[PDB]
Symmetry: D2
């Protein structure tokens, strides 16, 4: 047992009567002009209003949202608030206050620049965080990093509350306050991992993504999606596609129908970097969860190659891996073409679900290291995808046992649309 | 277009005010002592009470049920009725009446025998029925069959209403009146196909399976399921498992979680025959929907072989095909072990989605016929799985263009747990 | 005896065109008069709930976003019902609005009121118990033809009488929406719930009180911080209007009772000098039909009305006409014998105005003799007019269906209780 | 002031993991063959199944029920259970059990006899109970009465939890655990009082009767009512009609409509005793809530006389009053007839809301005692309506300052339908 105890300093309750805790934000619209603020109040429902104003302008405005609550087995939640601030300006710092009529707390965020071809952005990559001491040091190596992350693409598995007796949802609240120091100030883009299914019918809890969906909203209707568990956002020069590994994706299902139609919406002249987020990797040579992503691979891989996805980011496997550019899309049951071959139109598959979880690393790998695999290692850490312009983006992996400025693995992503060089 | 016109005789409306229509029955519990009675009233809600009595004794009792309505875009449904009759006795003819308050109508069913190893039973196999003239021929061939089926395992794609403008749900209503002359007297076992999804966000009909799940209910709680789209039923000497090709089946999901624990519950020494139903086939050498069943095969194929399923029935492809007993469960990305090999531990895969649909057949086969494909032919028709004892089952395939008693293909099934011997033709 | 207009009447014709909006009606959507609820129904498919609206002055076309709802009643299924609120309008300007923007649109207009003030003149038409007989149609023709300009209808309950038809056949709600649209699409009607909107029919498994009416006709009840749509307050021009529900609870401690006790405290007679109460069931009524039915709510609310010097209480329910004297009956205490209404110049005038048509029957039988609290009564179909001249004066007038559209069978000058409490008896 | 502390013994938590608490039963159907078993589990949801059996047969049954929860402002309830036991034998002792998965608890009840003309039965009448020490004293006098109550007709106002900051619904839990020692073995027939309204729009709790209606169920569908707040049951020789004082009752409203039909359905030839329960008294000569009962009386009083109601019970006034058979139904606005008169066809109106509340008795009476008032006294206590046969019922009032066997007031009821004799 390596999760931080309940009295740990990261879980300290903010002082004040009905003081907002678990404050977290993510993108509110498709293009970054909106932001959705979320927080929990414990002592009474409280106001869902959010006071915000820009850094040097100070015209204080108010946005109204909605309160909701949920129960899980024995656990009754605090009063959860979700509020969307809209029509914000690009490249502008804002302040926002929350808990307006009782104990107010103020936070900050900087909206991204407007969607554009040559607009740089620094995305952090954090996967399978949990709330162990390893979870805390990874969040630390991230906030201290010289390259300065502006949004965290989170590839799934958040709290691991479901590891506790009856999924002790108090450990949802503790994870909420723990991550607040990062997610209250810059957006985290949510994808749903297996530890968010929380399908526990043996305690009459049979509705999937029950607590995760109540606590973490995404702007899924902005991309015409009919579920929060797959959606799309555009930010700076990135077009980001988030899939649900544990929702349906057969032919005709909504997510399948949505992804087919969203792919051909992508405009690489406006967003050169096509980034796909999912939880379970389609390419992974570790023994843990080996070949689990094969089902989705049969359904979606040829579309990734068809639309030249730059990179696919997954978690689930508690280690780090980086494939070569390969595709396994020629198999026809009896023709023998069942081996991945080098394909300059294929994405790079990176597994970055090594932020700590409950404190265990996946170290047993299939040996020998297959040819489709570039780099792999079982160490805790996080990733950084730093878009420079339309042709270059520098990815880097930071180990938890290294200094915050040390890159144990780094590659130049050459854009599949504007600069498809061998990499 | 080849669908029967609206004023066809198999579409006409039962006479009398608020006369029940679209009456269908299905097994209402795990072991076959219950039945779900389902019908619709068009003129007013009416009673959901069901009067029933055995022909032998004959004390007439009432079952209290539930009624529901729904809307699909600019369509408003009539009044759907669902009522479960329980504590029935085995191997007994029962009469039952609906429309008790105005226009009553009488039908009957025969409860199956109690489950035992050697209990014989005839299952009809229908898939992708629709409401074409081809569909009517198949229904007629099934009910004139000399081997007399006692239950229809239906492997998906029912009315094809989703092909009419705005999915004109009136063609759900017509399909109920059409298929009533069979499913009102014997239970059909329902699988959700791809034409039941009806995900239509352009007219904000985004709740998958909404019309199908309103009209056709299913005893999914009896097997501890949390969804109607996957469940199990025991009936005579068989254990049937119905799966949802178009629901989540990833590791850790409800259907995935439900299936692996249901397979552990199967006692072959009590139900010898293990049958699995899905809409999209895992083995399919027809070009239509080629390799669509791969994503499920990657997850469930090894389970079918380890628990030694007897037969997997599917549709989706609008033709017939019987497979050899093969498995493809040794693939490891880089090892090249990706060809189906003979496997006497594996089930036989039958595609049986040639009941008629909207009148087109799938004849573009991948050539040459692959080694995993025993028999295939592009003809409309149905199939029959005839269980004799714990060891033998006779599967035959009847064509619409042949006589009702002619079998153009037949294979004797050796039970995987009681007669583990090669049964290839 | 069946005096209801047949369905092929010209008042019931369907607006042509694929999914033409119909049953278009408007009512105030705020407290002060800067908002409009635009209500309509589409029969062919859902369609857009969006309203295009602009003023004849500026001309800027803006869009308001609304909400789509449907309902069933027995074997009836409704069309696609739309409610959209237009907000932040300018006062005293004429607005055009368009609805049905995705296929065939239809244009109407309204004139927002002046904003509330002490001497703002305004004309209120008074229609009750309308229904859809031919008599109903003569009344609506007369109000439209009135020489002085009715700017808003205050409706004191009982709209379509669809509940008289077998299974309440709510085709007769659609019929009524189309029938009245010719007036309510261009000036707001302020709705009161009557007994015919209850539609409590357990014998056909239909136990939701007020449902068809509540789905089709919305009110700005949250603007007055009311918890229910059946009691609410609005302010228009120099008038503060309090709509009560005769067929909801009103015991001490109930929401209606609680809400009303507080709402009187908010009245500002120096902003809205005219204090108007609407309720379906009359507290004063000397007809045999529904005699003394108002006695229960009179015991709870009469004293408050007098305490706050209410100017008038308009009611329907009785299918005829009556205007009370300024009387009160608030001194009863079981054993003190004081159960006679007395002259009370602080009390409102009670006017019964439920004679617009209904299913075509008048309530002609009366309590004899005419009691002292009754100042004028007649069993005639007609409609009324409350024309505010200023803070001291307001002219009420009753007009019969059998007279010229300018002939006032009854007419009285209302002297304002807060600003000019002169005796204004018959 | 006088509300019993949380550490009191009446509020103690039954021991054991997830032990059922606040157990309380009530008539489950129209005739007495059913019983609604209700309890709250605090540690986890638990099973809503009830295991029951009769002493005559001792064959144990399982009855499945429902589970529910609610929030109120800033309070989150435990897991409320409601299960209906049916087709019970008449006049039979049944044992029932709750908490079947972890901590099991066992209780017992005796079903009433089949409804009949001369079937005796002894009802207790508690009103405005509360949580004070005066409340515990009334409950003691009830359970110690040599007359032995068999069911409680409770004329409303249960916990008074709405007198606490934001109605602190922990005070509903305590009241549940305190009244259990009577209501777990004996059915209480629930009337809704004004302290159940809990209309607190300022903390966005605007659903009237929310905490009450979740915690206490009534067989209101058995008499074709569409609302828990008005309903009727038959029990032994009594037809009992429960009315909702704080709901709509205008002409055409549901409760008005339901009451109109229900009085026409009374068969005095089988249940000759016509009992009506409301919270607000139609007859009251006390200062407190004087004349508040007027509105409903102007609506329902003539019906009560026309159908020969035997007695109407009410609380709300924290005292005791017994009216004469009196009527005030001749008023026609201008005829001056607004003075109650003797009327042997009218019911007796009793105020019995003196069970304790929060400990404040309503002492101030209007003087002198009007003619319609036969007896009145401001003392804490309870009442008993003891049916002997179709002819006779002996009502008696017990004061908490007297012994448990002393009747400070008592009177013999002659049945209005079967014995229209002056019962002065
Ligand atoms: C419905 O219920 C009524 C009250 O419960 C009942 O009226 C009572 O009837 C009893 C008789 O059962 C009355 O008691 C008798 O009255 C005189 C009074 O002095 C006594 O002498 C008499 O002595 C008894 O005599 C019996 C032999 O004849 C024998 O049991 C003993 O000797 C015993 O001492 C009784 O005590 C009582 O006063 C009545 N109460 C009233 C009128 O309030 C109704 O009759 C009953 N209806 C029926 C039974 O149909
Ligand atoms: C389980 O059930 C299966 C049923 O498919 C059994 O396998 C079948 O067994 C039957 C015999 O019961 C056999 O058919 C018979 O072949 C006989 C050849 O002589 C013919 O019978 C003749 O006609 C008369 C009727 O029995 C009789 O009077 C006469 O003496 C003569 O025998 C006739 O052709 C029968 O149909 C099938 O060939 C066989 N099917 C196979 C092997 O696939 C199986 O044996 C049963 N198991 C147990 C333990 O009972
Ligand atoms: C549900 O919506 C569909 C789609 O609108 C309705 O079908 C359509 O109904 C119209 C009648 O209003 C049909 O009219 C066609 O259009 C021209 C006008 O340009 C008309 O003059 C022609 O005679 C022609 O028929 C249209 O064909 C039809 N479309 C279909 C059936 O695909 C349908 O009636 C609605 N159903 C319900 C139950 O509301
Ligand atoms: C509340 O009740 C449930 C069931 O009524 C308790 O759990 C059940 O009981 C035991 C564990 O308590 C589980 O199996 C048993 O293990 C014990 C060893 O402790 C042994 O004697 C037997 O071999 C027996 O199989 C059982 O699976 C379990 N079931 C479930 C669904 O939990 C539960 O512990 C109770 N909670 C408490 C007391 O807090
Ligand atoms: C996009 O960013 C890349 C990295 O920032 C550019 O490549 C780098 O440019 C540096 C000049 O600032 C140079 O020293 C590096 O050698 C070079 N290559 C690296 C870091 O791998 C990239 O391309 C450059 O841009 C133009 C203006 C010229 O300098 C070229 O010679 C370079 O290739 C940038 N591309 C664009 C379109 O901005
Ligand atoms: N007509 C009236 N007669 C007496 N008191 C009245 C009357 N109208 C209003 N009141 C007030 O209502 C208050 C009653 O307190 P209240 O909260 O309404 O119920 P309560 O005192 O708790 N009695 P109860 O409802 O049985 O618990 C009294 O103290 C009076 O000030
Ligand atoms: C939710 O229910 C659980 C039961 O599983 C409670 O945890 C147990 O409580 C009992 C006594 O209350 C202890 O003996 C156990 O050791 C506890 N832990 C277990 C069983 O893992 C828990 O307290 C409840 N939570 C809330 C918020 O009420
Ligand atoms: C309020 O309006 C009334 C009615 O219009 C005014 O009284 C009238 O005053 C005019 C003079 O302009 C006279 O000719 C009429 O005879 C009056 N009518 C009546 C019925 O007396 C009154 O002056 C106005 N009060 C104001 C403006 O304060
Ligand atoms: C988590 O890390 C921060 C530094 O990043 C430290 O201040 C804090 O005490 C740590 N909390 C733990 C280890 O519980
Ligand atoms: C209704 O009223 C109008 C008068 O404005 C008229 O056009 C119509 O013919 C009248 N009668 C009927 C039956 O519609
Ligand atoms: Fe993980
Ligand atoms: Fe098909
Ligand atoms: Fe009327
Ligand atoms: Fe009280
Ligand atoms: Na996975
Ligand atoms: Na077919
Ligand atoms: Na309360
Ligand atoms: Zn995972
Ligand atoms: Zn298909
Ligand atoms: Zn009326
Ligand atoms: Zn009270």
């Amino acid at each position: 047992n390596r999760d931080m105890p309940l009295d740990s300093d990261v879980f300290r309750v903010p002082p004040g009567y009905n003081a907002p805790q678990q404050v977290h934000i993510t993108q509110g619209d498709l293009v970054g002009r909106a932001m959705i603020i979320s927080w929990v109040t414990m002592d009474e429902p409280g106001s869902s209003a959010v006071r915000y104003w820009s850094e040097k302008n100070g015209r204080k405005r108010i946005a109204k949202g909605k309160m909701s609550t949920y129960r899980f087995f024995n656990y009754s939640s605090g009063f959860i608030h979700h509020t969307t601030i809209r029509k914000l300006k690009y490249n502008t710092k804002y302040y926002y206050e929350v808990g307006l009529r009782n104990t107010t707390r103020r936070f900050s965020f900087i909206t991204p620049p407007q969607t554009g071809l040559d607009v740089p952005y620094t995305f952090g990559l954090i996967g399978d965080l949990g709330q162990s001491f390893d979870s805390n040091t990874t969040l630390s190596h991230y906030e201290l990093s010289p390259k300065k992350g502006q949004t965290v693409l989170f590839v799934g598995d958040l709290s691991y509350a479901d590891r506790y007796p009856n999924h002790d949802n108090v450990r949802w609240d503790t994870w909420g306050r723990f991550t607040e120091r990062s997610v209250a100030y810059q957006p985290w883009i949510w994808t749903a991992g297996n530890h968010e299914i929380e399908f526990a019918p043996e305690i009459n809890e049979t509705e999937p993504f029950k607590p995760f969906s109540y606590r973490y909203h995404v702007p899924y209707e902005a991309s015409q999606s009919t579920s929060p568990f797959w959606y799309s956002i555009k930010r700076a020069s990135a077009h980001i596609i988030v899939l649900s590994s544990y929702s349906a994706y057969g032919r005709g299902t909504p997510q399948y129908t949505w992804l087919k139609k969203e792919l051909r919406k992508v405009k690489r002249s406006e967003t050169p970097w096509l980034i796909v987020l999912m939880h379970s990797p389609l390419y992974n040579s570790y023994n843990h969860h080996f070949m689990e992503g094969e089902a989705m691979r049969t359904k979606f891989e040829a579309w990734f190659v068809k639309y030249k996805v730059d990179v696919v980011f997954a978690g689930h496997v508690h280690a780090y891996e980086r494939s070569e550019r390969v595709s396994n899309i020629a198999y026809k049951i009896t023709n023998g073409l069942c081996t991945p071959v080098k394909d300059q139109s294929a994405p790079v598959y990176i597994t970055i679900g090594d932020a700590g979880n409950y404190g265990v690393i996946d170290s047993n790998m299939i040996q020998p290291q297959p040819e489709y695999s570039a780099f792999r290692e079982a160490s805790f850490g996080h990733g950084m995808f730093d878009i420079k312009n339309r042709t270059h983006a520098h990815f880097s992996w930071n180990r938890n046992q290294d200094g915050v400025a040390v890159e144990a693995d780094s590659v130049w992503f050459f854009n599949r649309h504007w600069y498809p060089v061998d990499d």
